């Protein structure tokens, strides 16, 4: 019955601001501890911070890589949690999750303040931080696919002639621009359509030996 909804994600330039919201339902939200957890793309989970309940003065504990920049607050009449983001850096890019935090403390072998475990998780919201702007791709052929390079933002769609086709995931190269290739395997005895709506660009390049 427990349900968690992250929302408020989007695009922001470095140094900008943003507010994330996690609406909760199912449990007793007034007493339950809540935690923000972020995940950089292609990396592991990272503990951002948690907020406590009424008996703890609603104290909040932050990560040192995050101290002074983010803030956690909660509105119990709406059953929503908030993660204020100020001076947002490019390293803050990733999916942020809100999780119901449980408290554990064995009486015989525990050690204060005990341990914390994250029972129920949301499906997260995506936050992207970059200094680049809208740019159209430069499609270059691949003598026997199409090299779609210098394009931003996601996504792009690649078709062929309006089997053996594969479009790879894009690599965010060091310049902040994405790049992918779409190769097609055809027999040695025998036009790619690239679209980019954020820049409103359509390219119909032919591949020739």
């Amino acid at each position: 019955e427990v349900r968690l909804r992250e929302s408020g994600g989007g695009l922001v330039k470095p140094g900008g601001s943003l507010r994330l919201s996690c609406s909760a339902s199912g449990f007793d939200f007034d007493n339950a501890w809540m935690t923000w957890v972020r995940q950089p793309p292609g990396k592991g989970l990272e503990w951002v911070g948690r907020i406590t309940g009424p008996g703890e003065g609603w104290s909040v504990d932050y990560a040192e890589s995050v101290k002074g920049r983010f803030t956690i607050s909660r509105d119990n009449t709406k059953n929503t949690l908030y993660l204020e983001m100020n001076n947002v850096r490019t390293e803050d890019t990733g999916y942020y999750f809100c999780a119901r935090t449980g408290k554990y403390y064995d009486f015989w072998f525990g050690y204060p303040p005990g341990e914390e475990y994250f029972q129920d998780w949301g499906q997260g919201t995506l936050v992207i931080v970059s200094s680049a702007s809208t740019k159209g791709p430069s499609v270059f052929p691949l003598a026997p696919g199409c090299l779609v390079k210098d394009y931003f933002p996601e996504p792009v769609t690649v078709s062929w002639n309006s089997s053996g086709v594969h479009t790879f995931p894009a690599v965010l190269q060091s310049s902040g621009l994405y790049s992918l290739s779409s190769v097609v395997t055809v027999p040695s005895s025998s036009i790619c359509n690239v679209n980019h709506k954020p820049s409103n660009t359509k390219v119909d390049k032919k591949v020739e030996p």
Partner: peptide, 17 residues
């Protein structure tokens, strides 16, 4: 939930002794 969690765990460590 009326008590402070961070105070309870400190005193259960004392009752163990």
């Amino acid at each position: 939930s009326l008590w402070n969690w961070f105070d309870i765990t400190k005193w259960l460590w004392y009752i163990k002794k």
